[PDB]
Design a protein around this ligand. Sequence first.
Ligand code: NI
Ligand code: NI
Ligand code: NI
Ligand code: NI
Ligand code: NI
Ligand code: NI
Ligand code: NI
Ligand code: NI
Ligand code: NI
Ligand code: NI
Ligand code: NI
Ligand code: NI
Ligand code: NI
Ligand code: NI
Ligand code: NI
Ligand code: NI
Ligand code: NI
Ligand code: NI
Ligand code: NI
Ligand code: NI
Ligand code: NI
Ligand code: NI
Lengths: 271, 267, 264, 273, 94, 95
Amino acid sequence: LPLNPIPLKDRVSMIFLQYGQIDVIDGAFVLIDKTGIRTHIPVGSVACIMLEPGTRVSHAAVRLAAQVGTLLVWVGEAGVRVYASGQPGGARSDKLLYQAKLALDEDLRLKVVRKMFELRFGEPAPARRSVEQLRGIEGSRVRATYALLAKQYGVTWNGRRYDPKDWEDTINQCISAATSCLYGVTEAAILAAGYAPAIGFVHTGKPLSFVYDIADIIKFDTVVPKAFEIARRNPGEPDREVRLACRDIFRSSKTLAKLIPLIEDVLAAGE
Amino acid sequence: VSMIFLQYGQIDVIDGAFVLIDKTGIRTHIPVGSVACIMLEPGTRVSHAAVRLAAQVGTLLVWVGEAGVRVYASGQPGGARSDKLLYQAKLALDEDLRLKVVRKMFELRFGEPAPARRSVEQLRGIEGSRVRATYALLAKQYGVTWNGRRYDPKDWEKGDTINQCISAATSCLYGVTEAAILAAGYAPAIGFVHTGKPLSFVYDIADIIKFDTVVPKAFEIARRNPGEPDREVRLACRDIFRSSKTLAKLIPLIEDVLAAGEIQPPA
Amino acid sequence: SMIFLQYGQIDVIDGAFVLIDKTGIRTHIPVGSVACIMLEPGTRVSHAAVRLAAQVGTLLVWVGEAGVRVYASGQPGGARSDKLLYQAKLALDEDLRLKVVRKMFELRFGEPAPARRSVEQLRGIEGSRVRATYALLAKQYGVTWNGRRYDPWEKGDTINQCISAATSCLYGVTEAAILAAGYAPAIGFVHTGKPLSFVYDIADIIKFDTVVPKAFEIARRNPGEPDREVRLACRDIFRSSKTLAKLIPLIEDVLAAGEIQPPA
Amino acid sequence: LPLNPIPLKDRVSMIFLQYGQIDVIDGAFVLIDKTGIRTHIPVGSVACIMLEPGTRVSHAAVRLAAQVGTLLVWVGEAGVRVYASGQPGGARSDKLLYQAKLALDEDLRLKVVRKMFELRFGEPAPARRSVEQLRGIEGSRVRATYALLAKQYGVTWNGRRYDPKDWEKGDTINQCISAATSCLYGVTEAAILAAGYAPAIGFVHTGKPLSFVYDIADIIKFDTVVPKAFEIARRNPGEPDREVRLACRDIFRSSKTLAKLIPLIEDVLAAGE
Amino acid sequence: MSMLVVVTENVPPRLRGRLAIWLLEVRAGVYVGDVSAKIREMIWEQIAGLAEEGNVVMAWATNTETGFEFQTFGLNRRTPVDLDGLRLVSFLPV
Amino acid sequence: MSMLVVVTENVPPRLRGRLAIWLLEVRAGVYVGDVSAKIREMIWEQIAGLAEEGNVVMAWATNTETGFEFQTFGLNRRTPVDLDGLRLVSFLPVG
DNA sequence: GCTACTGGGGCCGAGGGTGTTCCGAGCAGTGCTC
DNA sequence: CACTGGTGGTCGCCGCGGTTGGAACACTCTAAGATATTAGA
DNA sequence: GACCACCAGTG
DNA sequence: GCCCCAGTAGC
Ligand code: NI
Ligand code: NI
Ligand code: NI
Ligand code: NI
Ligand code: NI
Ligand code: NI
Ligand code: NI
Ligand code: NI
Ligand code: NI
Ligand code: NI
Ligand code: NI
Ligand code: NI
Ligand code: NI
Ligand code: NI
Ligand code: NI
Ligand code: NI
Ligand code: NI
Ligand code: NI
Ligand code: NI
Ligand code: NI
Ligand code: NI
Ligand code: NI
């Protein structure tokens, strides 16, 4: 009797696990505490499981997670992604070769970049502009957008600073955790649909370029403003508030349901 | 491209190095620069610090079966290096480069180079004929009753012992082959002869060394006819992959097959 | 006429309602010998019995002991529309409603009401007389009186508990009487709005005559679980005084004083 | 705990009980078979419970069913209503006095009758027609509708015969119609009682103990209930009662009659102004 | 109208009958029905008032991420836990 | 997205873990979830293929007049009965 | 029924040519009672 | 922890101003060899 | 007569 | 070293 993954839209967004060993008991994903408190995890119903520091995963656990099509993501402090294990062959050859074909030809690559721009800012990109120019426009627009959300939500803002060194400043932590959730479910979606997260168009060079493209498209529409809202209240547990808030945002926005057709419509530029 | 197989222990980090603690207490300190790929066999427990270290130094982690008989999971999923994926994909999209890679696969599988006149489909037919004759010839060499390759895909227990041994053997071979394709940094779905399937490249590279050892071993196990032929063939392929170092010899074969496309490698 | 049946199964034998008891004492009942059958706890009704009561038009009312409570009743919502429209016409017309209220006052208190008094004025007179009656009974039975104070159970005064239980029983028998006569318990004249207003009226007519002085009689003592003692005392008073039988002519006279042609 | 009743729309249509004794076990409405098979029944979650011959309900059972606002309907052949039991004071004084006020005045009564005619047939009634004349027109339209459905489904028709007393040897069509319309009269009576009105105070039908039920149910009877009975009668099955109860259940679920009954009552009485 | 499941453990029979009034006891102590929000709240009033010494957990269909929510009454070896908003069940060891 | 509940009795631990893969085990043998039609059918394939010795019941929300439906695998003292289309549960005596 | 314990055994359930079809009242002596 | 059995004890759980997408099939090709169709990719 | 509360015994 | 399987009481 086989065991196959369920579609992504029918799953929950994410599950954060910490401080405990992850075993397989009777064929189930189980999180055992140091005190012995067993906690079953419906791995087949989650899009991705974030493994915080303190989690000792077993071989059967990674096997089971991969078999039911649930991405494992080792994360560090503030939920920043450290590593990930998934299906060693979840990519469909037609979609993977299509994505790669669009990535190799620079014409279709420019078409996909401009399509990403138009889908991001709701207006067509300026004509006769190169990929670098559109990326610089993206930088200025994102900077001014962070500033505008800052003035609207009444949060002290000075810059992005994604490095946790200069934090010491809870807004950057909230944005990093929120965008970390979005990157987790986005990488999970890209793996599920059959595409390559490393083959990208805008954020080329980075190992998760396509994840950064797709997620950067819908970042400020849903996830970042909620991070500013969590940051304004200044709670004692910013990570938990950002995770719960992102969970509600993904639920109400149907993010998991819209991620794959977003990718298809993005790559649909090169007919 | 170096790698190591860990088994029956817990992988922690001590003094900034991978350590494999055994059931008996035998620590195996592994420097970060000494291995580029860690195969995790059954019975291993991975700690968070180890995954963080392997991530920061770029070490590939592949949860596999014993001796890479099955590839269950792999870190950096979907492909890590994009230049190698676009290299393989570029080789597979252009018909000239595709035909070149296919011809190199043929020349490596059978010692004789293929006829130059033929296209990919004609080479596929030649492959089919040679595989038919090889099935018959092995059937006579080991003295097993052979009625063909046909099996029942719905129920496993409805096929011949020889078809079970061949199918299990090719399963293990797809295991090590997939391990080599992942360790080399290429996509298993981007195939040349086989296309459309998510493991087409695994079938391509695995068809090259298939009838060299593992299939004859399947005919041997079928000749002995044990009670559990699937387990005997799987353990036999395990021992073949360990003793002959098949996984180590597969990666240069991949790089050479793709290298015959006459396009500069990523490197 | 009506009969109370308890502790046995009701079936049909050769065309008659038979009550079968654990002792084997059959109780045969012709189809026309009862206009209503009060079913006390412990009665199981066979389908043929309900079918016969339907064929002859007999009302079945599932009640408590001596009608202390009214749980259900056959012909739900009333089977006679003539009496319903009679009570309703008595209630909608201001003149007739006032006449009925005055009749309630004259049959409750031994003297007729002051003339040219409205329903709200007679209501105030009623409240004052009720208060004087509460104080008088408190002095007569030696019960410490603080008022009609109750928190909407056990965490409260005992006298108001006994009064609440007693009035509950009286609303029971009064409801059974109103149902037996063929009228709606919701159509009231003094009380208006609640689904048991008429019950509160007819019960208010005879409330302080027997059941409330008995509630103060049990409050004079200090027994465990006063609810059960008051319920049983009210039961024995309803059986001994035949309150359910005497309440129907009281209703027919209260409604009759509206000077309307009553239904036969 | 008071256990207050459930709204009627949330309930299930109907449940038929054929044999065994009905008891209350630990506060539960249980049907005990003669073999000892106990069958608990969600009395609180069903609009009306039908009691076929062979059932022997207890006092606590009628008390419980009445307390949870579930009408008990004793039925006979083809489920024709024989008796009923419900709450002793489950009627709302305001709605009952409104229905009574409409019934007392001749003008308001005629208004409600004209509203019933306009909601039953697809055209308003002629003006300045008395109640008797409109009742005759209703009779002719109903007879022609029976004949029309009989000719549509191809059933040997002789005329509507309400009571099973007048049934002949092989009259199955009137059996199906009687069972179906009996179910409709059951849920309609449960809705009238639940809403707080009197089932005996009618406007078109008068003098019968269920006049208002026959009015409100006669308004929406032929829209869906009767032609399905003609279909089942055309099939002529072995168990017509169970088939008719199935089809009536699916019609009450599809048309959502149990939820629409009370708005139909208030919209019919609303014409009295 | 949402789906409702009430699974009880070590409760007096009064609560089992009361739950049998509105719900369907498909297994020993497992009740299934379809009720509205107010009816669900009333049923929970019954549960909290009548359990006294047993553990009863009730789940109902909603529009949350998991599609349903649940709450407990009384102590049990299977205790709910909150994971950044997503409520799961942990098994306390002996 | 319909709500699902699965009550297992005397099943091997394989089926219990397999049900724990997708559904939440709120009580011993009582699993709750929210799945689609196909996922529910697959879960029923797991049950019918792994129950082997025990009795399982599966109920899910639908558009029926009761609001839900249910089917069983195996034998139990509580047997579904059909009352004119309304399926209830009867309690069989000893024997 | 379920649950805990505790050695013994196995590392295991596969097979691949391709895409296309708020308000009245009283009445006692400002509060009670309806 | 759910079900069963027998016997003593109760008939009860209340109050009452009115109103405001997946599989069926359709195919390429080749070398053996039923020199047609078939087994293998 | 119907129904509940109590208190173990067994699987 | 991880995990399933079988029997074996115990409540
Ligand atoms: Ni970016
Ligand atoms: Ni297979
Ligand atoms: Ni109270
Ligand atoms: Ni009063
Ligand atoms: Ni009529
Ligand atoms: Ni149980
Ligand atoms: Ni154990
Ligand atoms: Ni052990
Ligand atoms: Ni051991
Ligand atoms: Ni061992
Ligand atoms: Ni096997
Ligand atoms: Ni084929
Ligand atoms: Ni004075
Ligand atoms: Ni017993
Ligand atoms: Ni007894
Ligand atoms: Ni006794
Ligand atoms: Ni006794
Ligand atoms: Ni007041
Ligand atoms: Ni030849
Ligand atoms: Ni091949
Ligand atoms: Ni007795
Ligand atoms: Ni070992």
